[PDB]
Amino acid sequence: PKIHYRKDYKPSGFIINQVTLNINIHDQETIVRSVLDMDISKHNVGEDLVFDGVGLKINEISINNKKLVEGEEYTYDNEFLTIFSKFVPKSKFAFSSEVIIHPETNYALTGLYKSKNIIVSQCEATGFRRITFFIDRPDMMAKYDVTVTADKEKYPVLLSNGDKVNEFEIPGGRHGARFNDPPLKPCYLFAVVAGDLKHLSATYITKYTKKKVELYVFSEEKYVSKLQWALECLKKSMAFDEDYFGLEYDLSRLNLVAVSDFNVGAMENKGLNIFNANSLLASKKNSIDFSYARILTVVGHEYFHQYTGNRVTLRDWFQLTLKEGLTVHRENLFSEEMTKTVTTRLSHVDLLRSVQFLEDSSPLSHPIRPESYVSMENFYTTTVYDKGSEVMRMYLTILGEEYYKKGFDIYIKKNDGNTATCEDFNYAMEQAYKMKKADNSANLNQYLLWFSQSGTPHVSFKYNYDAEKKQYSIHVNQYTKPDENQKEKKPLFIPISVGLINPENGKEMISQTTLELTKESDTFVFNNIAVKPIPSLFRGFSAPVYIEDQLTDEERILLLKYDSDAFVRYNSCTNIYMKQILMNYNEFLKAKNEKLESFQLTPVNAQFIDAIKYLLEDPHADAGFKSYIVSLPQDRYIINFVSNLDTDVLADTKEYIYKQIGDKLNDVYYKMFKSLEAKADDLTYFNDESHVDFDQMNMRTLRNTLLSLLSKAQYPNILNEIIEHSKSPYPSNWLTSLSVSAYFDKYFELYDKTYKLSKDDELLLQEWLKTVSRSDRKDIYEILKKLENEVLKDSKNPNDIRAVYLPFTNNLRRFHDISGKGYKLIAEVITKTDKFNPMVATQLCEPFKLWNKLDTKRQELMLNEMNTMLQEPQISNNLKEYLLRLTNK
Ligand SMILES: CC(C)(C)C(=O)N[C@@H](C(=O)NO)c1ccc(-c2cc(F)c(F)c(F)c2)cc1
Ligand SMILES: [Mg+2]
Ligand SMILES: [Zn+2]
Numbered sequence: 106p107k108i109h110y111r112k113d114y115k116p117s118g119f120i121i122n123q124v125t126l127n128i129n130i131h132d133q134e135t136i137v138r139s140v141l142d143m144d145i146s147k148h149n150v151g152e153d154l155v156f157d158g159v160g161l162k163i164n165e166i167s168i169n170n171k172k173l174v175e176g177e178e179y180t181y182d183n184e185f186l187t188i189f190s191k192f193v194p195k196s197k198f199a200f201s202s203e204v205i206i207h208p209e210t211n212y213a214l215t216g217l218y219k220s221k222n223i224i225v226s227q228c229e230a231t232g233f234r235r236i237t238f239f240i241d242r243p244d245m246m247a248k249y250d251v252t253v254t255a256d257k258e259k260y261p262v263l264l265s266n267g268d269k270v271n272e273f274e275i276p277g278g279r280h281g282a283r284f285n286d287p288p289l290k291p292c293y294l295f296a297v298v299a300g301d302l303k304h305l306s307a308t309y310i311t312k313y314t315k316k317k318v319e320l321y322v323f324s325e326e327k328y329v330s331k332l333q334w335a336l337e338c339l340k341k342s343m344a345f346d347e348d349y350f351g352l353e354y355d356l357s358r359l360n361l362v363a364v365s366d367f368n369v370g371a372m373e374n375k376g377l378n379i380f381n382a383n384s385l386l387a388s389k390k391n392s393i394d395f396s397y398a399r400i401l402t403v404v405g406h407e408y409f410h411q412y413t414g415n416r417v418t419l420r421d422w423f424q425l426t427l428k429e430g431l432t433v434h435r436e437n438l439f440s441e442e443m444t445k446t447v448t449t450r451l452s453h454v455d456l457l458r459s460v461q462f463l464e465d466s467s468p469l470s471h472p473i474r475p476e477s478y479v480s481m482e483n484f485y486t487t488t489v490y491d492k493g494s495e496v497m498r499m500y501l502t503i504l505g506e507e508y509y510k511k512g513f514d515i516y517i518k519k520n521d522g523n524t525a526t527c528e529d530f531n532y533a534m535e536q537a538y539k540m541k542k543a544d545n546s547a548n549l550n551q552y553l554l555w556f557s558q559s560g561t562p563h564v565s566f567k568y569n570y571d572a573e574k575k576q577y578s579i580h581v582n583q584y585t586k587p588d589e590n591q592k593e594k595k596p597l598f599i600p601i602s603v604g605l606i607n608p609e610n611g612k613e614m615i616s617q618t619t620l621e622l623t624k625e626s627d628t629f630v631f632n633n634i635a636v637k638p639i640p641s642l643f644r645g646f647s648a649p650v651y652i653e654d655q656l657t658d659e660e661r662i663l664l665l666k667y668d669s670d671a672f673v674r675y676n677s678c679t680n681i682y683m684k685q686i687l688m689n690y691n692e693f694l695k696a697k698n699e700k701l702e703s704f705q706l707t708p709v710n711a712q713f714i715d716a717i718k719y720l721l722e723d724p725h726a727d728a729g730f731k732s733y734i735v736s737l738p739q740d741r742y743i744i745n746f747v748s749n750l751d752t753d754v755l756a757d758t759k760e761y762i763y764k765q766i767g768d769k770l771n772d773v774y775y776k777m778f779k780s781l782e783a784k785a786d787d788l789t790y791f792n793d794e795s796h797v798d799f800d801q802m803n804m805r806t807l808r809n810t811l812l813s814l815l816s817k818a819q820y821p822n823i824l825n826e827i828i829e830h831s832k833s834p835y836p837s838n839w840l841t842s843l844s845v846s847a848y849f850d851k852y853f854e855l856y857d858k859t860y861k862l863s864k865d866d867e868l869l870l871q872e873w874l875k876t877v878s879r880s881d882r883k884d885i886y887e888i889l890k891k892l893e894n895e896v897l898k899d900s901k902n903p904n905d906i907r908a909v910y911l912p913f914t915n916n917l918r919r920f921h922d923i924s925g926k927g928y929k930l931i932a933e934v935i936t937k938t939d940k941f942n943p944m945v946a947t948q949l950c951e952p953f954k955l956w957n958k959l960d961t962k963r964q965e966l967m968l969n970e971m972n973t974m975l976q977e978p979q980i981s982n983n984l985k986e987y988l989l990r991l992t993n994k
Contacts, residue, residue, distance in 0.1 A: 430493020512537030
């Protein structure tokens with residue numbers, strides 16, 4: 106198994122200047138003819154000409170129109186085509202080939218494949234070589250001239266990159282289209298689509314040069330009514346890159362296409378963005394609320410790639426975070442501007458500190474720019490993407506908006522049309538840094554450690570206040586735990602956005618201030634501080650770190666009530682919860698270990714419960730923020746703080762804490778649940794797909810969160826509310842009615858009701874599956890078996906498989922059943938899936954990522970299932986590599 110090392114990058118000895126493709130689609134085969142106009146580079150040392158080509162059936166290959174003979178002049182081993190140097194020309198030459206591929210049986214959804222009745226490609230990262238021979242790496246930039254032919258009745262819509270320059274009829278009911286794309290691109294941005302597509306379209310006029318851009322959004326005919334929000338999001342995206350970054354679109358046309366079968370969310374193929382249907386299609390009748398932010402972010406994300414990925418592209422795959430981290434950052438700026446709700450930023454922090462922190466403390470831990478890889482399909486991680494985004498966002502925190510924009514524009518102007526590396530970006534940011542600090546001596550060399558060093562830093566604090574001197578000190582320390590990537594961790598450049606709150610009146614005591622911590626520790630002193638403050642630390646979550654604020658719960662409560670920063674308020678609440686959770690966990694653990702007949706639990710802080718009531722009852726407070734404060738921290742966030750975590754003991758801890766708070770606040774919950782109804786469920790704009798109200802959706806989030814808390818608690822007659830809720834027109838509401846009914850004898854009645862509502866929309870049925878999957882049911886194993894037999898069957902649709910199984914894996918009490926049966930079940934599904942889609946099989950491994958964090962029995966149970974998977978004769982390269990790394994082999 107070949108391991109690629111970042112330090113080993115060398116340019117190719119060859120050049121590919123022009124690609125000319127003919128893709129002839131038939132029912133039982135697709136014939137691909139390719140002419141590559143090639144040259145010898147300055148790096149050439151007379152080596153063999155080696156192409157990537159995977160699973161290709163050779164009809165013929167030729168050099169300069171002379172047929173090549175297998176054995177004597179070339180060998181093919183189903184992975185590499187080797188042409189021995191003596192037969193390779195020494196100047197400009199043409200290589201051509203004709204191969205047969207089979208998209209119809211291509212269930213791995215990489216290269217060219219059939220999704221329902223759409224033919225579609227996915228070439229990132231190294232899928233182009235599954236379509237035809239190539240030197241399949243992003244620094245091999247070429248021009249593309251692509252002709253697609255197909256049966257006209259089945260595939261009336263033909264798309265590829267660039268301009269459609271010809272359309273023509275073909276004998277036998279076929280029909281062709283030629284696309285010429287003169288600008289250079291890497292092959293992973295190639296795409297082709299064929300199908301009976303229906304569309305919505307609009308014309309966009311760019312801000313500055315007033316270019317007319319045609320916008321098309323496509324789906325299968327059945328779901329053409331679900332395309333409108335995507336189109337609006339695209340317009341929004343274009344406007345944002347114009348307004349914030351001063352960047353306009355450069356092509357005449359942009360196509361977005363939804364397909365039912367897709368490994369991930371979407372792909373940024375130049376002029377032809379291809380989407381998982383669940384990340385493009387929605388309507389208010391047939392989608393839950395979450396779809397609207399999802400489509401906004403994914404449409405935005407692929408649009409922002411047009412600059413950060415497509416126009417400035419990657420030298421090599423080790424630079425992945427340079428396009429992914431930066432594009433997620435651009436997408437997050439966009440989404441925060443469009444939603445105007447503080448929960449948007451909170452939700453990204455929530456995701457980072459739960460999923461990515463777990464990854465960063467697991468045996469899979471890697472820096473955002475790794476030093477090596479075996480499987481590229483395993484490289485697309487929350488670390489590379491979301492920690493990557495936070496590292497890109499820190500530049501903005503450090504520079505401030507004006508100098509950030511200057512630096513970003515330096516980066517684009519300098520590297521537009523070329524490949525780039527993480528260093529090129531840091532260099533651009535550094536120029537701005539020099540300007541901001543006003544001396545050419547300032548530099549960001551230390552900042553590069555954010556790209557190379559793995560692990561989450563820990564930042565802790567001590568405070569001192571001299572009342573007579575009016576002098577306040579914040580002493581700060583940073584620490585990263587050694588891991589397999591660095592024995593010795595170095596101090597990072599950590600920007601700490603801070604405020605100082607006067608606890609007597611809640612006012613700000615200093616102006617906007619960002620502490621630049623560049624050492625292992627430092628002491629920051631503030632003069633003319635009139636009274637002892639409460640520090641508001643890492644406002645906006647200003648660095649991706651473990652914050653150890655060393656504040657009392659009294660101080661945290663004061664911040665939660667009166668601080669100006671949504672993240673610090675939410676974090677203060679989070680920290681109060683975590684202290685409570687750790688304390689009760691240990692009390693429950695000791696009672697278990699010592700087999701106590703009786704014991705005491707520390708109650709939840711009453712002043713904390715009082716503050717929650719206060720915020721909940723404040724008519725001016727944010728609905729989304731409210732739903733965060735009544736929710737305990739995610740299980741995967743909690744596990745970062747506990748060794749040998751016993752999941753049962755944690756389930757008992759959560760239970761006690763929720764019951765403590767509900768025993769005091771349920772009447773408040775109920776009252777709010779009722780009074781929120783009118784605005785939350787307002788139907789005024791239900792038939793206007795262009796009208797999306799994120800505040801109103803947050804109000805429904807709060808109601809559905811409250812209803813969940815009231816149902817678990819068996820609040821008097823809450824079942825009445827549940828039943829009425831099931832009649833709501835909003836799927837967020839009537840699907841919530843299914844999951845909260847788990848605690849009642851009406852569960853299977855709502856099961857059937859909601860199934861009948863969901864079954865005729867592919868995506869809605871997937872949301873139904875998720876709802877069932879995450880239901881808090883004692884008979885959840887029997888229910889999963891029912892889904893398998895009645896609904897899922899032998900679907901190879903990744904959306905179906907992920908919907909049935911992943912939410913169940915977050916069932917703390919049941920997935921982690923001490924028999925190991927949940928581990929057994931998921932491993933069976935992974936092995937089954939790995940036979941046809943190794944990438945999705947590896948995604949289904951996610952629950953095992955925390956295996957060495959659990960109590961020793963469950964470690965052993967998980968490890969056994971992983972070793973059983975590893976011993977499957979037919980295990981994919983993807984899955985083997987992943988489990989080998991995960992189990993420290
Ligand atoms: C949901 C997110 C936004 C994280 C997503 O869909 N990411 C894709 C992306 O960044 N789009 O711009 C994405 C796209 C392709 C791949 C990808 C990588 C491979 F190696 C494959 F084989 C493949 F099929 C897809 C992974 C993630
Ligand atoms: Mg289907
Ligand atoms: Zn991306």
